[PDB]
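Why predict the complex rather than its parts? Because the way molecules touch one another can change local conformation, and only a joint prediction can capture that. The input here totals 242 residues.
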Amino acid sequence: AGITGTWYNQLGSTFIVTAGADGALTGTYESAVGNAESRYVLTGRYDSAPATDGSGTALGWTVAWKNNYRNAHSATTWSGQYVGGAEARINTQWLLTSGTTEANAWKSTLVGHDTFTKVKP
Amino acid sequence: AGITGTWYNQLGSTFIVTAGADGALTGTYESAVGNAESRYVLTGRYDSAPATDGSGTALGWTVAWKNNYRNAHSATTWSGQYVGGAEARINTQWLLTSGTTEANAWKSTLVGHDTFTKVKP
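Output of the joint prediction:
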């Protein structure tokens, strides 16, 4: 039990993460949607000493959508919390910002929400 | 890439970041006064091969609000783009998620926007 492991979101993406003792998140992300192919590097942070009152564990991570196969000139950040239990879950909201000209910057950012489970839905 | 260095927002915060050749963002996020109790690890990713058509450079990073002195049980992710030139800027939107119980999860996430400059206010 814990954050370290392989997770899947509701759209079939694969989030392979390690939670280090120092609060570091590392691993790879593979998206089933969008301008993306194969695995991408992710890095992020999580609360390594969460509250003991029943609250979830806050965390966030970033993927820049460049790898050896494609470059979408964009990056997604997921912000959320880990919730333990017999059906562990990470609930997130995300922002996907593209590199744009100034005239197009107003429409540079998509917003959404992803839920991750260790059992693929 | 023009990203490595010290950046300042509109509300008295500062971060020092190194943009690695591979796409890594690493550094420290802190307050204007710069005391140790206000400093936190920052980690993220950026597009290390941006477009050459005048578009910005997509990037994102996370700070979990725990250091050796305090812990807010929360984390912010900034998603945005770097725009170069004599008045360089990092223009972001952010999500700040707190660890909560399930009953309070509906109100776990704040949203906002931050612009960063290289010039100390």
